[PDB]
Amino acid sequence: TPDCVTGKVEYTKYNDDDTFTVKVGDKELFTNRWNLQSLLLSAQITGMTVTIKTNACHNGGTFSEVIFR
Amino acid sequence: TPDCVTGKVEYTKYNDDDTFTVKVGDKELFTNRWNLQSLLLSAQITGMTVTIKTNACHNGGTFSEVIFR
Amino acid sequence: TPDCVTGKVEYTKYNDDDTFTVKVGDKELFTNRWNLQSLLLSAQITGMTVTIKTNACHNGGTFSEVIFR
Amino acid sequence: TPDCVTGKVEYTKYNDDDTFTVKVGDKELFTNRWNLQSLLLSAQITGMTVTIKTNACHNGGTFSEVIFR
Amino acid sequence: TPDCVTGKVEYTKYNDDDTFTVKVGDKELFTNRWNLQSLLLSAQITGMTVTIKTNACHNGGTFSEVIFR
Numbered sequence: 001t002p003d004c005v006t007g008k009v010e011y012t013k014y015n016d017d018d019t020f021t022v023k024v025g026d027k028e029l030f031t032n033r034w035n036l037q038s039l040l041l042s043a044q045i046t047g048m049t050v051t052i053k054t055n056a057c058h059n060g061g062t063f064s065e066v067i068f069r
Numbered sequence: 070t071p072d073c074v075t076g077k078v079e080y081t082k083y084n085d086d087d088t089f090t091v092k093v094g095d096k097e098l099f100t101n102r103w104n105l106q107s108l109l110l111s112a113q114i115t116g117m118t119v120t121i122k123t124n125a126c127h128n129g130g131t132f133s134e135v136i137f138r
Numbered sequence: 139t140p141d142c143v144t145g146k147v148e149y150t151k152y153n154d155d156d157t158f159t160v161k162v163g164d165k166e167l168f169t170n171r172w173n174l175q176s177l178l179l180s181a182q183i184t185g186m187t188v189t190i191k192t193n194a195c196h197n198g199g200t201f202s203e204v205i206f207r
Numbered sequence: 208t209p210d211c212v213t214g215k216v217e218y219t220k221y222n223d224d225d226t227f228t229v230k231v232g233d234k235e236l237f238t239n240r241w242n243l244q245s246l247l248l249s250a251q252i253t254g255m256t257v258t259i260k261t262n263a264c265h266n267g268g269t270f271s272e273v274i275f276r
Numbered sequence: 277t278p279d280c281v282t283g284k285v286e287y288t289k290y291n292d293d294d295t296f297t298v299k300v301g302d303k304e305l306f307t308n309r310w311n312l313q314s315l316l317l318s319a320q321i322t323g324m325t326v327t328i329k330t331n332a333c334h335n336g337g338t339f340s341e342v343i344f345r
Binding site for chain 1 (some may be wrong): 289290310313314317
Binding site (some may be wrong): 011012013014015016018034037038041042044045 | 070102104105107108111112115117133134135136137138
């Protein structure tokens with residue numbers, strides 16, 4: 001899957017539909033994977049660099065693959 | 070959903086009905102989303118600025134949307 | 139419900155019946171709410187001041203309401 | 208349940224069966240309590256001293272009661 | 277289960293099939309145990325040494341047993 005954005009997690013958002021948004025690089029993207037919520041907030045808090053890979057690489061686009069570096 | 074309040078989490082409260090209350094800005098708001106409890110306590114502990122988004126923007130109002138910065 | 143004790147968590151204990159005990163101020167109290175276990179351990183580790191609210195405000199009293207500050 | 212051993216968690220072992228071995232002081236002890244399992248991991252991650260309470264205080268002994276200090 | 281690799285977690289990856297991959301030593305290994313995800317990211321974050329035990333000890337192999345040190 002192509003890299004979409006890489007960078008520290010700028011901010012995150014818990015959404016009303018229970019999905020979870022991250023702003024990384026130039027994009028907000030959201031995931032419907034419950035498991036990723038804790039992981040991504042941890043990554044935000046600790047300032048980890050993450051790479052979000054998705055074919056739907058647009059603002060508001062969906063993702064389910066993350067590399068934590 | 071419009072922003073309701075933004076600030077550090079002044080305190081949180083675990084309620085007898087197992088809902089979870091946050092005090093942010095000038096409002097106590099509560100959520101019954103279990104996923105949010107650990108996210109909100111982490112945001113409080115680490116001193117994140119959160120924005121609670123809700124249409125019940127008044128004391129005692131319910132919410133299910135949060136930005137963590 | 140009335141405040142019972144306020145202070146840092148002195149220690150916590152996971153009990154054989156799967157309830158969870160905290161010591162705050164001069165009182166040892168316990169809760170049967172699963173949700174509170176990780177929250178209370180996190181409060182303890184991070185040095186948060188908690189207020190345990192309960193009408194059973196005595197050693198061995200049960201509680202299900204906590205303010206984390 | 209009497210004290211068995213007090214110390215920092217030397218290692219934790221998540222087993223195939225999903226049981227959870229912990230080594231504290233010179234004792235390797237197993238527990239089947241999933242929640243207690245994740246509290247121990249948090250304790251080890253953050254450097255907490257714990258007291259494992261059990262009558263079966265030998266390698267391979269079981270427990271279900273811990274004091275997090 | 278026999279030892280596969282021992283080392284710090286170099287990076288981790290959340291996969292589209294909801295399994296989680298760790299790079300330790302010269303191996304990428306993945307697990308389907310949800311519970312291990314947070315613990316493995318934590319080990320990565322804190323620089324903990326892990327020992328992954330599996331018979332599938334080869335790049336891309338699966339695992340379900342870990343010792344956190």
